[PDB]
Design an enzyme around this catalytic site. Structure first.
Site, PDB file in Angstrom:
ATOM      1  N   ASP A  42       0.826  -1.198   0.000  1.00  0.00           N
ATOM      2  CA  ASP A  42       0.000   0.000   0.000  1.00  0.00           C
ATOM      3  C   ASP A  42       0.864   1.253   0.000  1.00  0.00           C
ATOM      4  OD1 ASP A  42      -1.966   1.886   0.328  1.00  0.00           O
ATOM      5  OD2 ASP A  42      -2.330   1.458   2.457  1.00  0.00           O
ATOM      6  N   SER A  46      -1.050  15.518 -12.004  1.00  0.00           N
ATOM      7  CA  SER A  46      -1.333  15.160 -13.384  1.00  0.00           C
ATOM      8  C   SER A  46      -1.585  16.426 -14.209  1.00  0.00           C
ATOM      9  CB  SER A  46      -2.557  14.238 -13.443  1.00  0.00           C
ATOM     10  OG  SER A  46      -2.946  13.965 -14.773  1.00  0.00           O
TER      11      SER A  46
END
EC number: 3.4.23.22
Length: 330
Positions: free
Chosen positions: A35, A199
């Site tokens: 994770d 992004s």
């Protein structure tokens, strides 16, 4: 040194991925959920409340000659899906794919919440976010990657998750055969303890690319892709019959649909998520309503590039002094 381990979907939907981890001496092999959105290595154990164990493999420190109780240390963690666990701490030898760390903090669960009990295939978590998020008190502990870093050939690990198929976590090297084209690297902020990046935008299907900054985290422990409501609405508007359902808890769509792809930007580069990766199947057995793999982050407080996005790429978690993230197509 390096390590290389195969990671395997837990079910037919890729709801999560498990990776075998050797703990203790002799080795006890547990299948852990790697994770990159948390920083605790915790396991089901001989100390876990018996009624809260249902099929998991447990770590028994008393059977490990290298286990040592970390006196006074406790841990307690809550995750984004409302699940939680807590317990005490041992140090022991931990190996992943041939890479060994001695003195690793292995957090032994005394208590786990119902969804962990119900996930018989997940024996614990191995956190790969920054150690500043580790919950051990009163002495915070380092992640497996943090402990291994100095010994690695290069201070990196990579995630290569499969779509409905196994993939690979590598430590200490970049497998140049595992991706196509070039890796595009992008800046990371560690201010919140995550692999947080921005992004450069998105496209839906064959549509034009929208240049827009989307801050979020690369999170292998989250199943879906969580993005701003504007982006998500633009995606699902291209699927006839798709709607956000308060009762289901997100966007659903007719199981008869062909889903469009979703593209996200990494600098000037583009990662394409095929439409099939966005299908999470019937909301309940036999239903013709299917659950979407792109969901709104509104009310989470952060955008999350989870497995839906990450499995479309070869992802480099670069733990150099100034960390960065790299993405390549594959």
């Amino acid at each position: 040194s390096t390590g290389s381990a195969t990671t395997t979907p837990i079910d037919s939907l890729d709801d999560a991925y498990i990776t075998p981890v050797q703990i203790g001496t002799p080795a006890q092999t547990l299948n852990l959920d790697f994770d990159t959105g948390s920083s605790d290595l915790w396991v089901f154990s001989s100390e876990t409340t018996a009624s809260e164990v249902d099929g998991q493999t447990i770590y028994t420190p008393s059977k490990s000659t290298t286990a040592k109780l970390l006196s006074g240390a406790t841990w307690s963690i809550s995750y984004g899906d409302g699940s939680s666990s807590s317990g005490d701490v041992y140090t022991d030898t931990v190996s992943v794919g041939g890479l060994t760390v001695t003195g690793q903090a292995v957090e032994s669960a005394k208590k786990v919440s119902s969804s962990f009990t119900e996930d018989s295939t997940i024996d614990g978590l191995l956190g790969l976010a920054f150690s500043t998020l580790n919950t051990v008190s009163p002495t915070q502990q380092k992640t497996f990657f943090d402990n291994a870093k100095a010994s690695l050939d290069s201070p990196v690990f990579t995630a290569d998750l499969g779509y409905h198929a196994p993939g690979t976590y590598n430590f200490g090297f970049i497998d140049t055969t595992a991706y196509t084209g070039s890796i595009t690297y992008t800046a990371v902020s560690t201010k919140q303890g995550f692999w947080e990046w921005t992004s450069t935008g998105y496209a839906v299907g064959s549509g034009t690319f929208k240049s827009t900054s989307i801050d979020g985290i690369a999170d292998t422990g989250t199943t879906l892709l969580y993005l701003p409501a504007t982006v998500v609405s633009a995606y699902w508007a291209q699927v006839s019959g798709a709607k956000s359902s308060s009762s289901v808890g997100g966007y659903v769509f007719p199981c008869s649909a062909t889903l469009p792809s979703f593209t996200f930007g990494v600098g000037s580069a583009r990662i394409v998520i095929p439409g099939d990766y966005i299908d999470f199947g019937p909301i309940s057995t036999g239903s013709s309503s299917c659950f979407g793999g792109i969901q709104s982050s509104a009310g989470i407080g952060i955008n999350i590039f989870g497995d839906v996005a990450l499995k479309a790429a070869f992802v480099v978690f670069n733990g150099a002094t100034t960390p960065t993230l790299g993405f390549a197509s594959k």
